[PDB]
Amino acid sequence: SNAPDNYFSGQQLTLARAIENGEVDEVIKLASGTDLNKPGKEDMTLLFWAVMNSINNQKTPERLNVITMLIKAGADPLQPRPQGKNSPAEFVLMADNADWIKAMLNAGLSPNAVDKTFGKPIIFQTLEAKNTKTLQAMLDKGADINITDSLGNTLLIDALDFHSYDHVLLLLERGADPE
């Protein structure tokens, strides 16, 4: 049957079970003596495991706090996956709401962070979301609204180019430099 044992063994499996249980104090305890960043099987990581298991109407605030506590303990929210697949922070910036990114910003994720594969500001991932909530979270936490990619494009230029009007209008309302 399907269980965290699909991905993890040993001390990582013990911590994956505490994550699955939404047990914040036990996660805090186990994290110290667990390799937080070594992938398990199928490229699964403990932090991706915490993002998946947060989707539960039981103990929801505590399950978001498990994400925060894993990052404070040294789980890397910017760790890439193989073959150019993205990090937990980049992944949750495309989501329909900002609960995940807020849990990571609460653990000291920089709103100006760049990805470790390509060096792109992770805030560009918000332009892929269906609404402006993750961009609002990053700008609210003090992201540079005028940060550029390697070719000098801003969030505003990219949003205009794709006709992502809701993102354009939020960026303008927040004072994004149009030149």
CSV table of C-alpha atoms in Angstrom, one decimal:
chain,number,residue,atom,x,y,z
A,1,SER,CA,0.0,0.0,0.0
A,2,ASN,CA,1.0,3.7,-0.4
A,3,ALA,CA,2.6,5.4,2.6
A,4,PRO,CA,5.6,7.7,3.4
A,5,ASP,CA,7.6,4.4,3.4
A,6,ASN,CA,7.3,4.6,-0.5
A,7,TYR,CA,9.9,7.5,-0.2
A,8,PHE,CA,11.7,7.4,3.1
A,9,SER,CA,13.5,4.9,5.5
A,10,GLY,CA,15.2,5.2,8.9
A,11,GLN,CA,15.2,8.6,10.6
A,12,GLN,CA,13.8,10.4,7.5
A,13,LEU,CA,10.8,8.0,7.7
A,14,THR,CA,10.2,8.8,11.4
A,15,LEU,CA,10.2,12.5,10.5
A,16,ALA,CA,7.9,12.0,7.5
A,17,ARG,CA,5.4,10.2,9.8
A,18,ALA,CA,5.5,13.2,12.2
A,19,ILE,CA,5.0,15.5,9.2
A,20,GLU,CA,2.0,13.4,8.0
A,21,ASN,CA,0.6,13.5,11.6
A,22,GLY,CA,0.8,17.4,11.7
A,23,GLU,CA,2.9,17.1,14.9
A,24,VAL,CA,4.8,20.4,15.1
A,25,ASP,CA,6.6,19.7,18.5
A,26,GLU,CA,7.7,16.2,17.3
A,27,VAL,CA,8.9,17.7,13.9
A,28,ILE,CA,11.0,20.3,15.8
A,29,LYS,CA,12.5,17.5,18.0
A,30,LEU,CA,13.3,15.0,15.1
A,31,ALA,CA,14.6,17.7,12.6
A,32,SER,CA,17.9,18.2,14.5
A,33,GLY,CA,19.1,14.6,13.9
A,34,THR,CA,17.6,14.1,10.5
A,35,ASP,CA,19.2,14.8,7.1
A,36,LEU,CA,16.5,17.3,5.9
A,37,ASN,CA,17.7,17.9,2.3
A,38,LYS,CA,18.8,14.4,1.1
A,39,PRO,CA,16.1,13.3,-1.4
A,40,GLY,CA,14.3,10.0,-0.6
A,41,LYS,CA,13.1,7.7,-3.5
A,42,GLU,CA,11.6,9.2,-6.7
A,43,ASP,CA,13.2,12.6,-6.0
A,44,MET,CA,10.7,13.2,-3.1
A,45,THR,CA,12.1,15.5,-0.3
A,46,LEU,CA,10.8,16.1,3.3
A,47,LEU,CA,9.8,19.7,2.4
A,48,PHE,CA,7.8,18.6,-0.7
A,49,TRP,CA,6.3,15.9,1.6
A,50,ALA,CA,5.3,18.7,4.1
A,51,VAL,CA,3.7,20.8,1.3
A,52,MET,CA,1.6,17.7,0.1
A,53,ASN,CA,0.5,16.7,3.7
A,54,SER,CA,-0.5,20.3,4.6
A,55,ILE,CA,-3.7,19.7,2.4
A,56,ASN,CA,-5.9,18.5,5.3
A,57,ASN,CA,-8.9,20.3,7.0
A,58,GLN,CA,-7.6,18.7,10.3
A,59,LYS,CA,-4.9,20.8,12.1
A,60,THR,CA,-4.5,23.1,9.0
A,61,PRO,CA,-2.7,25.9,10.8
A,62,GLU,CA,-0.3,23.4,12.5
A,63,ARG,CA,0.4,21.7,9.2
A,64,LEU,CA,1.4,25.1,7.6
A,65,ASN,CA,3.5,25.6,10.7
A,66,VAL,CA,5.3,22.3,10.0
A,67,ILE,CA,6.5,23.9,6.7
A,68,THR,CA,7.8,26.9,8.7
A,69,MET,CA,9.5,24.8,11.3
A,70,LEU,CA,11.2,22.4,8.7
A,71,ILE,CA,12.7,25.5,7.0
A,72,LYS,CA,13.8,27.1,10.3
A,73,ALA,CA,15.5,23.7,11.1
A,74,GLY,CA,17.5,23.8,7.8
A,75,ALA,CA,15.1,22.3,5.1
A,76,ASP,CA,16.1,24.3,2.0
A,77,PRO,CA,13.0,25.8,0.3
A,78,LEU,CA,15.2,26.7,-2.8
A,79,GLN,CA,16.6,23.2,-3.3
A,80,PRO,CA,16.2,22.2,-7.0
A,81,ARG,CA,15.0,18.8,-8.2
A,82,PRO,CA,16.8,16.9,-11.0
A,83,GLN,CA,16.4,17.6,-14.7
A,84,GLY,CA,15.6,21.3,-14.1
A,85,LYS,CA,12.4,20.7,-11.9
A,86,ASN,CA,11.7,23.4,-9.4
A,87,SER,CA,12.1,24.0,-5.6
A,88,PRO,CA,9.3,24.0,-3.1
A,89,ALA,CA,9.3,27.9,-3.0
A,90,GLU,CA,9.1,28.2,-6.8
A,91,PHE,CA,6.4,25.5,-6.8
A,92,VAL,CA,4.1,27.2,-4.2
A,93,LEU,CA,4.5,30.6,-5.8
A,94,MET,CA,2.3,29.3,-8.7
A,95,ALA,CA,-0.5,28.2,-6.3
A,96,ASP,CA,-4.1,29.6,-6.1
A,97,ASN,CA,-3.5,31.1,-2.7
A,98,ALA,CA,-0.6,32.3,-0.6
A,99,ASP,CA,-0.8,30.1,2.5
A,100,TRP,CA,2.3,28.0,1.5
A,101,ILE,CA,4.5,31.0,0.5
A,102,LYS,CA,3.4,32.8,3.7
A,103,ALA,CA,4.6,29.7,5.8
A,104,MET,CA,8.0,29.9,4.0
A,105,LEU,CA,8.3,33.7,4.3
A,106,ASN,CA,7.6,33.2,8.1
A,107,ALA,CA,10.8,31.0,8.2
A,108,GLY,CA,12.9,33.7,6.6
A,109,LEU,CA,12.7,32.9,2.9
A,110,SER,CA,13.8,36.1,1.2
A,111,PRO,CA,11.1,37.7,-1.0
A,112,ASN,CA,14.1,38.7,-3.3
A,113,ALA,CA,15.4,35.1,-3.4
A,114,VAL,CA,16.7,33.7,-6.7
A,115,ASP,CA,16.5,30.0,-7.7
A,116,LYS,CA,19.7,27.9,-7.3
A,117,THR,CA,19.5,26.4,-10.9
A,118,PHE,CA,19.1,29.6,-13.1
A,119,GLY,CA,19.5,32.5,-10.6
A,120,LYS,CA,16.1,33.9,-11.6
A,121,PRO,CA,14.2,35.9,-8.9
A,122,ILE,CA,11.6,33.3,-7.7
A,123,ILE,CA,8.9,36.1,-7.7
A,124,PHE,CA,8.6,35.6,-11.5
A,125,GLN,CA,6.8,32.3,-10.7
A,126,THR,CA,3.8,34.3,-9.4
A,127,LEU,CA,3.1,35.3,-13.0
A,128,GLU,CA,2.1,31.7,-13.7
A,129,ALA,CA,-0.6,31.7,-10.9
A,130,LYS,CA,-4.4,32.0,-11.8
A,131,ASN,CA,-4.7,35.1,-9.5
A,132,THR,CA,-2.5,37.7,-7.9
A,133,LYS,CA,-2.5,36.3,-4.3
A,134,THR,CA,1.1,34.9,-4.3
A,135,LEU,CA,2.5,38.2,-5.9
A,136,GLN,CA,0.6,40.2,-3.3
A,137,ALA,CA,2.2,38.1,-0.5
A,138,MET,CA,5.7,38.7,-1.9
A,139,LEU,CA,5.3,42.4,-2.5
A,140,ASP,CA,3.6,42.7,1.0
A,141,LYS,CA,6.8,41.1,2.6
A,142,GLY,CA,8.9,43.7,0.8
A,143,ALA,CA,10.0,42.1,-2.6
A,144,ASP,CA,11.7,44.6,-5.0
A,145,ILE,CA,8.7,45.3,-7.4
A,146,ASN,CA,11.3,46.3,-10.1
A,147,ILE,CA,13.6,43.2,-9.8
A,148,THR,CA,14.8,41.9,-13.2
A,149,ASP,CA,15.6,38.6,-14.8
A,150,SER,CA,19.0,38.1,-16.5
A,151,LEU,CA,17.8,39.8,-19.7
A,152,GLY,CA,16.5,42.9,-17.7
A,153,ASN,CA,12.8,42.1,-17.9
A,154,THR,CA,10.6,43.2,-14.9
A,155,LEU,CA,7.4,41.5,-13.6
A,156,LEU,CA,5.4,44.3,-15.3
A,157,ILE,CA,7.1,43.8,-18.7
A,158,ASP,CA,6.6,40.0,-18.5
A,159,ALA,CA,2.9,40.4,-17.4
A,160,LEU,CA,2.3,42.9,-20.3
A,161,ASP,CA,3.9,40.6,-22.8
A,162,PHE,CA,1.6,37.7,-21.8
A,163,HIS,CA,-1.5,40.0,-21.5
A,164,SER,CA,-1.8,38.8,-17.8
A,165,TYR,CA,-3.9,41.9,-17.1
A,166,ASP,CA,-4.7,41.2,-13.4
A,167,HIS,CA,-1.0,40.9,-12.6
A,168,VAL,CA,-0.2,44.1,-14.7
A,169,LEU,CA,-2.9,46.1,-12.9
A,170,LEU,CA,-1.8,44.9,-9.4
A,171,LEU,CA,1.9,45.7,-10.3
A,172,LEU,CA,0.8,49.2,-11.5
A,173,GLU,CA,-1.4,49.8,-8.4
A,174,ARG,CA,1.7,49.0,-6.2
A,175,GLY,CA,3.8,51.5,-8.2
A,176,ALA,CA,5.9,49.2,-10.5
A,177,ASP,CA,8.2,51.4,-12.6
A,178,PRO,CA,6.8,51.4,-16.2
A,179,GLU,CA,10.3,52.1,-17.8
